[PDB]
Design an enzyme around this catalytic site. Structure first.
Site, PDB file in Angstrom:
ATOM      1  N   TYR A  64       0.640  -1.339  -0.111  1.00 14.99           N
ATOM      2  CA  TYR A  64       0.011  -0.110   0.043  1.00 14.99           C
ATOM      3  C   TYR A  64       0.793   1.351   0.126  1.00 14.99           C
ATOM      4  CZ  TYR A  64      -4.239  -2.574  -0.156  1.00 14.99           C
ATOM      5  OH  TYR A  64      -5.278  -3.500  -0.624  1.00 14.99           O
TER       6      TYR A  64
ATOM      7  N   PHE B 120     -11.079  -3.268  10.011  1.00 18.20           N
ATOM      8  CA  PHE B 120     -12.036  -3.183   9.362  1.00 18.20           C
ATOM      9  C   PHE B 120     -11.685  -3.517   7.962  1.00 18.20           C
ATOM     10  CE2 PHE B 120     -10.467   0.529   7.478  1.00 18.20           C
ATOM     11  CZ  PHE B 120      -9.809   1.286   8.344  1.00 18.20           C
TER      12      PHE B 120
END
Lengths: 396, 396
Positions: free
Chosen positions: A125, A396
């Site tokens: 990322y 999440f």
């Protein structure tokens, strides 16, 4: 060929399938429908293989509307990326890149200052502008030897059934998340989800118990394989007293040999004990990752340390603008400029600094952040630090 | 019964015996005689069982003359406790207590501002006023996956036989130890001992090699059990360039799967890589422990962060004096007072703060240091912090 678009309700079964195949932990189609409520209209992207009907989902990605607490007890609207997945049949075809670009465009246009995620892998990322911004720290305490220090604070704590004290957990967590950088608002739907996990699962996890205090709680269960290990899934304390009292109770689990918890690096637990080694670090890893979407908006929003004299510099983010950055009185003013840069860094480095989990001087030593001035470095270090150490609210 | 006194040459065999039985990794009489030259006249105490000759030694302790670097590149004479041992037959008879008391008295009278040790266990030394002051951080890198980040600096480093480059190692270490809090002067006798370990031991450790750079070196050997693991016993880097170049070389050890090193928490290595997880923390522990002998001498000796505005407070050390403490311009003045205290803490807590390895706010959350002022806490926090992260020079 391949096409990128917003899913229909027709695309869902395909997405659930891809999700089931991509995430072992996949919470069922049912449980996925609680998180769905956090996805805004237009917060989802799919890649279909082919055009027309009967095209199958080979890529998906979405973001959730979150509220992230940052230093100075400031709450930012935050776009949380989740359920990102590429079909095992379509790797290396540029799907992740296309899906992330599209989502970032939407996130930016919608007015989020920051995006965030939990990374399934560590080398993905950074290229998209995300920097690791919190650190998960597992402590394993051998409670057989654990004795509390004469100075430790402390019968205020009760052993309770989680499902019977939801209101008290919500109120405590709510106070917790507003005071701690890394805190996230936890919506009702996620409290439903969480409390449903508490029941013992045949062939799965043993039932959960709670230790409750006026100002904190812990949720724990015996490990399924190791029966002398208690796993603390969650411990929220808003006062030091609550934090100490909860640990006295956990160390009181005489049936156990070891208590483990995923916590943060500045957890004071080791210092509650007469032997600090007993609190062993058994695991360390990046937690929440941050992408700064809007540099000026984000830099101006957070508080800064008052224990730094006012100073001014020029910050260049690679492909993210150049700014005159003035910090003083715990506030930042951040304005466009074309004056020569004094500090340069990629976008991801900035997200790593943003919540105080990484020091500018450490990133500079890695040449990840470049400046001419050592004094400037110490000042950034000092200004970006957080009074309240940064913690991780929920995956999440 | 038992008597406490300074050993004669008659007592050495007893001491060696007790030493061999107390420390597996015992420095044979041979090596013990090298460290022995660092022991000042009167730096040793023994406990004999019985009076007169014919009494066996059942207790021993000593200290060595060391030079410790503290923040601000200040070098303090430090008394390093070592070879502390009580016979397995005389535990819990007050021998450690009596030996430490006597040695501390000698150390104070001799004019040492600080004492230091490496602790075989974590729950022994706090009671004697030592606080853990550095943190050992083990990183294990899976080099099969490790790729350096585009930003990383970088030819320059050479693979060499340690024993042929002593002069270069000395000069590099010497520069290293003067710049880094935790640095210790390494005397010729210790360089002798170190370089003698480099040769392959029959049935023991494998041969050591060195990676040498103008501004840093690494010493490593293949693990004896795991032959795909390379162990870096020591890596001293004076510049960020040297640190990165050495790691490019280590990651270049293609016949290896994993490289491990005992390092410090702010090691920038993880940030040199495209995947920061690859640098796994596999172990964490207290390193050097500190006992502040003379509070005012020690507080005035070290440098403080320039980023904090000048401030004044009253510090009380439990059984260690009360002092008006004024810090400004990176300097402290520390004078006797009977004014009401604003901060209290045991002596050991001060040792843990002294080198910047532990935050005052973290010890306060554990109630190991009391104040009624949060602002005062932030200031202490910021003032005691170190520009150059604290590292551990060699065990003793």
């Amino acid at each position: 060929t391949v096409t990128l678009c917003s899913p229909t309700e027709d695309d869902w079964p395909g997405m659930f399938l891809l999700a089931a195949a991509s995430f072992t932990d996949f919470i069922g189609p049912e449980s996925a429908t609680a998180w769905r409520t956090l996805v805004p209209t237009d917060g989802a992207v799919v890649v279909r293989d082919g055009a027309g009907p009967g095209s199958e989902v080979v890529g998906m990605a979405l973001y959730m509307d979150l509220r992230l607490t940052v230093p100075g007890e400031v709450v930012l609207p935050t776009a949380g990326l989740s359920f990102v997945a590429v079909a095992p049949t379509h790797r290396r075809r540029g799907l992740l890149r296309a899906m992330c670009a599209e989502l970032h465009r939407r996130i930016a246009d919608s007015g989020y200052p920051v995006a965030a995620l939990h990374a399934s892998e560590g080398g993905i990322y950074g290229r998209f502008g995300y920097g690791p911004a919190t650190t998960l720290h597992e402590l394993t305490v051998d409670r057989r030897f654990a004795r509390f220090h004469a100075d430790a604070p402390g019968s205020s704590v009760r052993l309770v059934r989680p499902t019977e004290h939801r209101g008290e957990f919500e109120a405590i967590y709510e106070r917790w998340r507003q005071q701690v950088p890394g805190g996230l608002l936890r919506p009702q739907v996620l409290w439903d989800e969480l409390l449903a996990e508490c029941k013992a699962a045949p062939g799965g996890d043993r039932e959960s118990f709670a230790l409750l205090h006026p100002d904190g709680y812990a949720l724990y269960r015996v490990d399924r394989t190791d029966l002398k290990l208690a796993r603390v899934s969650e411990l929220r304390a808003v006062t030091a007293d609550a934090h100490c009292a909860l640990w006295r109770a956990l160390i009181g689990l005489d049936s156990m040999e070891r208590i483990s918890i995923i916590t943060h690096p500045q957890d004071p637990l080791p210092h509650l004990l007469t032997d600090t080694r007993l609190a062993r670090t058994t695991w360390r890893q990046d937690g929440l990752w941050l992408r700064i979407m809007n540099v000026p908006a984000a830099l101006e929003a957070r508080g800064y340390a008052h224990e730094v004299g006012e100073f001014s510099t020029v910050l260049e983010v690679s492909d993210g603008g150049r700014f005159a950055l003035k910090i003083g009185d715990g506030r930042a003013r951040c304005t466009p400029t074309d004056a020569a840069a004094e500090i340069e860094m990629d976008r991801d480095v900035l997200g790593s600094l943003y919540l105080g989990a990484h020091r500018a001087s450490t990133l500079a030593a890695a040449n990840r952040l470049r400046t001419k001035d050592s004094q400037l470095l110490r000042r950034l270090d000092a200004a970006f630090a957080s009074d309240v150490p940064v913690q991780t609210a929920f995956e999440f």
